[PDB]
Amino acid sequence: MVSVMKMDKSPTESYSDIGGLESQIQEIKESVELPLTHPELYEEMGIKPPKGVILYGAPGTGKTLLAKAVANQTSATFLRIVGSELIQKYLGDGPRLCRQIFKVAGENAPSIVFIDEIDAIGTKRYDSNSGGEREIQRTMLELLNQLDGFDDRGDVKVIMATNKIETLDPALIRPGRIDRKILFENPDLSTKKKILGIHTSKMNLSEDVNLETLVTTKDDLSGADIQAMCTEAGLLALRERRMQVTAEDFKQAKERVMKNKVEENLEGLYL
Amino acid sequence: SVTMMTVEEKPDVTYSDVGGCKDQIEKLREVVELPLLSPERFATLGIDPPKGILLYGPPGTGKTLCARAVANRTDATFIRVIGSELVQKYVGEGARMVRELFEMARTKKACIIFFDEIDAVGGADNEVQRTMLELITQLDGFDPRGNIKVMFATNRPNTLDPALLRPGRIDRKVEFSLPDLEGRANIFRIHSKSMSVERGIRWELISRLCPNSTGAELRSVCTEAGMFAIRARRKVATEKDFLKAVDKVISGYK
């Protein structure tokens, strides 16, 4: 159980190299970091800052990239587990183990944790009359009751995640515990703005820039694929041996990859 | 003996640390204290007292604050009955807990239960029912004529056979729900009693902006205004700061 937990190996995911956003990200540093900077300020007006947050999904749109960037910044512990890895044949094994974190969170005041994709734990409170699968429903109750039985909150921190909420997660979350039910989804411009704000680092664009039109026409997509958009130009360079960095072959990838995932386009009706 | 520790070091609660609509407390305070302390009030009529405060209230409501309140008030001993220590894979060994509990409990005094979240174990190749049967064997014996009660809570009252829940088990039941604005107002006074603010303003009109909702978001939402004040650097809070985020907590939810 402990073995997976202490993942102290932050990657080179560079917090503040990411160009996504600010307000969300102050909101966490305000949630987390600044409380670890001068928390007397919370003591000035007498504040109990929050017990972690929960982002939402919109997959391939920046679930996690900050998070290992925070781990690159974490300046504290960092934890990592999976519910599917937590669960076992026998009864209450994992539930007996789930308790054993909070003492290992009692390890530290710098005690924080990411959690991995709950979608098979605490999903929804079906009666589960159909045998067996009540174990999950028997497990979530072992947590939430453990979570707020009688706790001074001991910097018992948390940050969670999923891909879809209303599919699951009916009653587990509650305010104060998780006051910040928050978002990540497409920006509608800023994928144009700061993504290649990053990727302009390496590449040369060895003839021009062209970026004034390598741009978004309010095109519904997810900028995560931009790290393909940088790729295949180099490949198509080497589909024709361009050792340099072009702007012309770069055209195809949006014309190629963004063109696959077609939409209905039934707007010959709202004119 | 995993939960072999009666109560904590310091319960920090009061019956006035709560809005809680003022009405759900009385019978609860009546059943728990009046047979306890004034059975002459029982024999004033010559009654058949109850044994349990059956209950259901959606979580994120101060029943559990209300639950931790009787702890700090009565000063007696206390328990916590949850599937973690209760439910165990070793068939039958799970029921050592209940027996050593109750067979002890009959000995002791003012050792009334808060066995909350029995919706875990009390739900309908599974052995949970036999533990639930292990319960009711214990209760029909002592059930009347005692200082002891059986008061706990849940999240899903329609998730259990009432074969256990006959009238001699939890008779004067309990029901919770969100407050009026006035209930939402008096609760708001509580968590307002810490910080610096623009003292002397019209808080009540914000409790007009409490539709169907929990108090828990209100003790929250004030801190986000301070967080909003933190980013605003507002050393003292105002009106609009509370507004600038509470407008967002529900719309982000809606």
Binding site: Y90, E133 | V91, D125
Partner: peptide
């Protein structure tokens, strides 16, 4: 010395 095992199972039945 053991007989105290019990493993959950998976089913999928018509609703």
């Amino acid at each position: 010395n053991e007989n105290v095992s019990a493993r959950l199972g998976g089913a999928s039945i018509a609703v």
